[PDB]
């Protein structure tokens, strides 16, 4: 039988303070960057076109991931209570996972499109929106929502009694109504680690490696510098995405693997994993933050208007 814990599960006051401090900075920086990107894409008509509407989709998804994931979690880190009640517990995670899917699939779409651009000839036009790209953007949104529906379906609210106290908490319910929901309960961590971390990394690395090959294996030397710089920025973007997203999925995986019900020390592990998860949310938002920074760093066309 499982014995009691060796100690208490808690979030340190200093940890709360430092996490909130970083979180407000992340919120402000991401909102400013994504707002500037949206201003550029939706205020000047000349800069809206096929290549840029995928960036717009990514920016909108990042705005959602910030505004519907940071404010809730930064509050929760302090309050330790669920304000919005039953109705919202089904909405917040569903839109969260929808937006995450949008971000990852839009990154994949950008990789595919850039490979196509380097590979083929004469892909230049002024204001214009190819039918294929308009189809694909909405298709990406739809597929993200379709994959995220299980999120909304499974979540619920339960009142609980703990440490001689009353609490109500929103979670993916341990008891599930149907076999599909039970499969989701049993697979969620690995499904997230595969489709939202491994699929974007694979489909970005493969296509960017093909693009770098196309640029470097075939025919002044300054264009060699330009090719080197473009390949550099692309692969640092891939690497920063990977590192920003890693710890959250890793926390989920370690939770699934190391948590032994019979281990008295399991709640020390659990307290650590809470720290790791709370870092992961902030750096996952930083992932969305870094995109406009990268555009400002490498896109001259944007630097003309992004900032003085």
């Amino acid at each position: 039988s499982p014995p009691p814990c060796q100690g208490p599960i808690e979030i340190k006051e200093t940890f709360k303070y430092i996490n909130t401090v970083v979180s407000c900075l992340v919120f402000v920086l991401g909102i400013i960057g994504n707002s500037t990107l949206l201003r550029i894409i939706y205020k000047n008509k000349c800069m809206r076109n096929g290549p840029n509407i995928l960036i717009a989709s990514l920016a909108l998804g990042d705005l959602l991931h910030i505004v519907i994931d940071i404010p809730i979690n930064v509050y929760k880190l302090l309050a330790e209570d669920w304000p919005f009640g039953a109705e919202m517990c089904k909405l917040v995670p569903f839109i969260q996972k929808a937006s995450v899917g949008i971000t990852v699939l839009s990154l994949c779409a950008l990789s595919i499109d850039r490979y196509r651009a380097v590979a083929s000839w004469s892909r230049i036009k002024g204001i214009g929106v190819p039918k294929w790209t308009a189809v694909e953007i909405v298709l990406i949104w739809v597929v993200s929502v379709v994959l995220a529906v299980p999120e909304a379906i499974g979540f619920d609210i339960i009142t609980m009694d703990y440490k001689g106290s009353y609490l109500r908490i929103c979670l993916l319910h341990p008891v599930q109504k149907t076999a599909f929901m039970q499969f989701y309960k049993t697979a969620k961590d690995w499904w997230l680690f595969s489709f939202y971390f491994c699929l974007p990394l694979a489909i970005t690395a493969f296509f960017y490696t093909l693009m770098t090959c196309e640029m470097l294996r075939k025919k002044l030397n300054d264009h060699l510098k330009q090719r080197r710089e473009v390949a550099k920025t692309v692969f640092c973007l891939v690497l920063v995405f990977a590192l920003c997203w890693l710890p959250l999925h890793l926390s989920r995986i370690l939770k699934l693997t190391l948590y032994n019900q019979n281990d008295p020390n399991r709640c020390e592990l659990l307290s650590f994993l809470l720290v790791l998860d709370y870092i992961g949310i902030n750096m996952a938002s930083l992932n969305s933050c870094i995109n406009p920074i990268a555009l400002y760093l490498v896109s001259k066309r944007f630097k003309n208007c992004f900032k003085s």
Partner: peptide, 15 residues
């Protein structure tokens, strides 16, 4: 249910 995991979900991030 195991109450410790419920408490984790209580403090844990919405994910």
């Amino acid at each position: 249910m195991d109450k410790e995991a419920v408490y984790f979900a209580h403090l844990d991030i919405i994910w």
